[PDB]
């Protein structure tokens, strides 16, 4: 399958050079997999989700995304026009308020909910969790993320947006999850993107067009945009059967585009997420 005039990040996922605009992918498109978007919520009514998005848990009075951050992130996972896995099932877990701010107790409880909820969901191809959030170092937050991964969920987390070593951030510093940095359309590490040995993969993160609340669209930047590229890629590759939740992060890193990004400091992987499209 091919999507012409795709967002540059989607085209980058299937290409071996910057500056293309057509996204090539297998028709399976992540159908049969599930991605939990742990964020401000998901506007499930957005026509770009085609009914494949639903809110399953909120730690606030409403389950609605009153901010837009979570809807944008979920759009990059599996929206029709802006998603990597255009046929996956999206589940919304609202751990961030409508200001985009989270809590220690709610974010930790949210990861516990996903591991307990996935049983009763139809996800024959596997379960993924996308965490476009982060904070200071916390062994508790790291332990909660590792426990979600050990439950049988591919956990992708954002590295952070402070141009700093992600070792001092959680859950970015948890080794057992997949920590994602951001790149720009010119294959340079995004000016804001965190780095460090704890990073596993890079994804498109600068000027990422995706869904927004009110049935609209918006282009924003951050490692919060790069993480759903990797979460959608994992769900796509798990549906294809070439990896599972336990092996997806290493498999993505093993099959990534190597050494093509610029301004990658020594000690940080030079790997860009790549679907290795087999026509």
UniProtKB/Swiss-Prot annotation:
Family label: Belongs to the peptidase S8 family.
Cofactor binding remark: Binds 2 calcium ions per subunit.
Active-site positions on this chain: 39, 69, 224
Disulfide bonds: 34-123, 178-249
Reaction(s) the record says it catalyses: Hydrolysis of keratin, and of other proteins with subtilisin-like specificity. Hydrolyzes peptide amides
Role played: Hydrolyzes keratin at aromatic and hydrophobic residues.
EC number(s) stated in the UniProt entry for this protein: 3.4.21.64
Protein name: Proteinase K
Group of enzyme by EC: hydrolase
Keywords: Calcium, Disulfide bond, Hydrolase, Metal-binding, Protease, Serine protease, Signal, Zymogen
Binding residues annotated for Ca(2+) 1, in chain numbering: 175, 177, 200
Gene: PROK
Alphabetical GO biological process terms: proteolysis
Cofactor or coenzyme needed: Ca(2+)
GO CC annotations, alphabetized: extracellular region
Recorded GO MF terms: metal ion binding; serine-type endopeptidase activity
Limits of the Peptidase S8 domain: 7-279
Superkingdom as given in the UniProt entry: Eukaryota
List of residues binding Ca(2+) 2: 16, 260
């Amino acid at each position: 399958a091919a999507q012409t005039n795709a967002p540059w990040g989607l085209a980058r996922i299937s290409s071996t050079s910057p500056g293309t605009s057509t996204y090539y992918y297998d028709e399976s498109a992540g159908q049969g997999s599930c991605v939990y978007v742990i964020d401000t919520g998901i506007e499930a009514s957005h026509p770009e989700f085609e009914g494949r998005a639903q809110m399953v848990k909120t730690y606030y009075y409403s389950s609605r995304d009153g901010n837009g951050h979570g809807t944008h992130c979920a759009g990059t996972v599996g929206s029709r026009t802006y998603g990597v896995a255009k046929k996956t099932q999206l589940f919304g877990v609202k751990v961030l308020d409508d200001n985009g701010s989270g809590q220690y107790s709610t974010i930790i409880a949210g990861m516990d909910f996903v591991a307990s909820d996935k049983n009763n969901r139809n996800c024959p191809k596997g379960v993924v969790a996308s965490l476009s959030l982060g904070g200071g170092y916390s062994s508790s937050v790291n332990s909660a993320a590792a426990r979600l991964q050990s439950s049988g969920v591919m956990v992708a987390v954002a590295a952070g947006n402070n141009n700093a070593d992600a070792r001092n951030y959680s859950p970015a510093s948890e080794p057992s999850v997949c920590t994602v940095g951001a790149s720009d359309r010119y294959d340079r590490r995004s000016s804001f993107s965190n780095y460090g040995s704890v990073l596993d993969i890079f994804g498109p993160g600068t000027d990422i067009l995706s869904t927004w609340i009110g049935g609209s669209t918006r282009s924003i930047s951050g490692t919060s945009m790069a993480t759903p590229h990797v979460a959608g890629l994992a769900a796509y590759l798990m549906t294809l059967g070439k990896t599972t939740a336990a092996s997806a992060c290493r498999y993505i890193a093993d099959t990534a585009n190597k050494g093509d990004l610029s301004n990658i400091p020594f000690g940080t992987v030079n790997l860009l997420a790549y679907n290795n499209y087999q026509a």
